[PDB]
């Protein structure tokens, strides 16, 4: 709307809201953004590798109700609750991001694809020369950080039990 959408469905000032809307319309004149736009903006931001599946998961998180193309209201609401929201909102967003399907548990293959999406970007021009093994140690470290049994509440508690990730949450909560 923009008339009453000052704080009801967003967490930004009028100036920030209007400039974000103008920029989005400049990049999306139709007013609706699709998956390919996410692909190409994510490739333009990081011009050092392949940026396909992580952008796909990001859009799927943004694609609420599986519409296939999110409008401005939900997009700006997500940006607001992730950049100027509460901690539980960020954890909910990360939960939905890491929950590709709709089960109550997060299994091995989900972490496999997530770590592949994280590690494929640097390509073949990195000093440590990453291989398929490093995702395996990373997933093992994450899983031993997770509960031993084959939990979203446990992941939440582990997130709030370590200050390194909490100080890695206000990195952008303050700026922009």
């Amino acid at each position: 709307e923009g008339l009453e959408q000052l704080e009801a469905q967003t967490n930004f000032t009028k100036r920030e809201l209007q400039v974000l809307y103008r920029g989005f319309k400049n990049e999306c004149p139709s007013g609706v953004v699709n998956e390919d736009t996410f692909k190409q903006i994510y490739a333009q931001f990081f011009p050092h590798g392949d940026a396909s599946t992580y952008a796909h998961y990001l859009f799927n998180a943004f694609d609420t109700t599986q519409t296939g193309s999110v409008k401005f209201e939900d997009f700006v609401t997500a940006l607001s609750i992730l950049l100027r929201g509460t901690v539980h909102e960020k954890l909910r967003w990360t939960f939905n991001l890491y929950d590709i399907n709709k089960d109550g548990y997060i299994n091995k293959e989900e972490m496999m694809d997530i770590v592949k999406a994280i590690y494929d970007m640097m390509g073949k021009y990195t000093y440590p020369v990453l291989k398929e093994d490093t995702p395996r140690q990373h997933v093992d470290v994450f899983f031993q950080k997770m509960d031993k049994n084959k939990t979203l509440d446990e992941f939440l508690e582990s997130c709030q039990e370590d200050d390194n990730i909490m100080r890695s949450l206000q990195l952008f909560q303050n700026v922009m």
Binding site: Q18, R22, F45, I118, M121
Partner: protein, 459 residues
């Protein structure tokens, strides 16, 4: 309509027409406002100068972006105006449309820019007036075929040589096989023609030459051709669509006569089929299709102008019938009477269609000569009717061929430019690692990714 709101109060007066008949609760006007007109000439400054319009003029089509409070997203509060960041001349046409309810497309503008301006303002391309709609549609179709050609094909195992095979100017082996099979087609047709000459396969000297060695030359060549056909059976992306392709039909038609003659002479000596075999032996000429760059162009041109050639056929048949009947009926009384039948007059009418002229068959009566002359002129005009269309299509397709080659070169240059820009961004990041405001946060996100993957980036 919603764009004639200024006449809405007049319709109020129309109530007085049926007011004596009117009888009811009359829930009264719904809390009307601003009894006197307070129409504000709201200003809309688009990347420079400004355009003023009445509020009802902009709000008579609320279904679009400029209706409702959506426009206020681009409202500029500190300046009390609407600073849109769009093109300031297409907006002029949008304003004229809003005033009229009808949009005109000026001829001298890029369609991509016009259409993206239309999309930015939340319009539909289907509201163009028929005066401009036809021109906009022509421009749509030309840029549509342009963008279609922009992304037609891209060069992308045992099947891999197939791409080499069907693009022989890729590998040395494919090119040599292509050239040598063309040479084989040529040598086979030359073998046929030098078989037909009396010095080779006639009893020129019964006393003594008649070589039956030519009976081998075809067979080997035929077998050679088979393998590449079999090759296309092996590396076939489509098992049945390939056969459905006209090329494969021509290849199998050229291949068959040798084998069908083998079977026939194995079982029968059917009269009139051996000469048919010799006749069909020549379609290696059509098998030349791949080597002839322009034969595909010719075939596509003929396919495109199918209706025109059909109309030519119909018209020429009608003219032949009319003229042959006329000349046979007005010439049957002659002494020689070579016009012995309507089919007899068919040959004369068809040799006088094309200004050909043989003198073997000419009319001998006063009406005959004049009808023959009129026949010749009518045939000339009829046969000349479709040739401009045929040659126009041929030259057109030639032009799309060359322009598609140039466009492919342009796309290669553009991908080279894109990868050069990628390399520039990469080395800029690397030198920033070694040592504008935007690049600060760009490299900040890059370093955040480096931290989250603990993998340092090298040159």
């Amino acid at each position: 309509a919603a764009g004639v709101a200024a006449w809405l109060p007049f319709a109020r007066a129309a109530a007085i027409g049926w007011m004596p008949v009117a009888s009811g609760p009359m829930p009264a006007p719904p809390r009307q406002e601003r009894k006197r007109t307070q129409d504000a000439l709201i200003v809309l400054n688009v990347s420079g100068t400004r355009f003023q319009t009445w509020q009802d003029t902009l709000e008579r089509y609320p279904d679009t972006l400029l209706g409702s409070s959506e426009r206020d997203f681009f409202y500029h509060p500190e300046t009390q105006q609407y600073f849109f960041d769009r093109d300031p001349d297409i907006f002029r046409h949008i304003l004229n449309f809003y005033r009229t309810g009808k949009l005109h497309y000026p001829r001298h503008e890029c369609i991509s820019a016009y259409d993206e301006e239309l999309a930015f303002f939340g319009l539909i391309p289907e509201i163009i007036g028929d005066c401009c709609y036809e021109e906009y549609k022509d421009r749509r179709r030309e840029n549509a075929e342009r963008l279609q050609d922009d992304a037609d094909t891209d060069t992308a195992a045992r099947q891999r040589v197939w791409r080499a095979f069907e693009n022989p100017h890729t590998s040395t082996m494919a090119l040599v096989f292509y050239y040598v099979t063309g040479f084989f087609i040529a040598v086979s047709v030359i073998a046929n023609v030098v078989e037909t000459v009396p010095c080779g396969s006639s009893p020129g000297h019964i006393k003594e030459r008649y070589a039956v060695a030519f009976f081998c030359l075809d067979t080997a060549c035929v077998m050679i051709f088979t393998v590449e056909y079999l090759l296309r059976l092996a590396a076939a992306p489509s098992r049945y669509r390939f056969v459905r392709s006209v090329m494969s039909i021509i290849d199998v038609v050229a291949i068959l006569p040798y084998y069908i003659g083998l079977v026939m002479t194995d079982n029968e000596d059917v009269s009139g089929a051996f000469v048919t075999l010799r006749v069909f032996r020549v379609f290696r000429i059509f098998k030349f299709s791949r080597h002839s760059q322009g034969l595909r162009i010719l075939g596509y041109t003929l396919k495109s102008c199918a209706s025109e050639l059909g109309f030519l056929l119909f018209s020429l048949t009608m003219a032949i019938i009319i003229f042959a009947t006329v000349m046979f009926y007005a010439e049957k009384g002659s002494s020689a009477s070579k016009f012995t039948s309507i089919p007899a007059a068919f040959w004369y009418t068809i040799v006088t269609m094309t200004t050909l002229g043989y003198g073997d068959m000419v009319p001998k009566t006063i009406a005959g000569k004049i009808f023959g002359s009129i026949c010749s002129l009518s045939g000339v005009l009829v046969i000349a009717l479709p040739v401009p269309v045929i040659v126009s299509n041929f030259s057109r397709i030639y032009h799309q061929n060359q322009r598609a080659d140039k466009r492919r070169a342009q796309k290669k240059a553009r991908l080279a430019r894109i990868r050069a820009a990628k390399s520039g961004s990469a080395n800029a990041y690397m030198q920033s690692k070694r040592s504008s405001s935007f690049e600060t946060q760009h490299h900040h996100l890059l370093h955040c990714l480096e931290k989250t993957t603990n993998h340092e980036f090298v040159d």
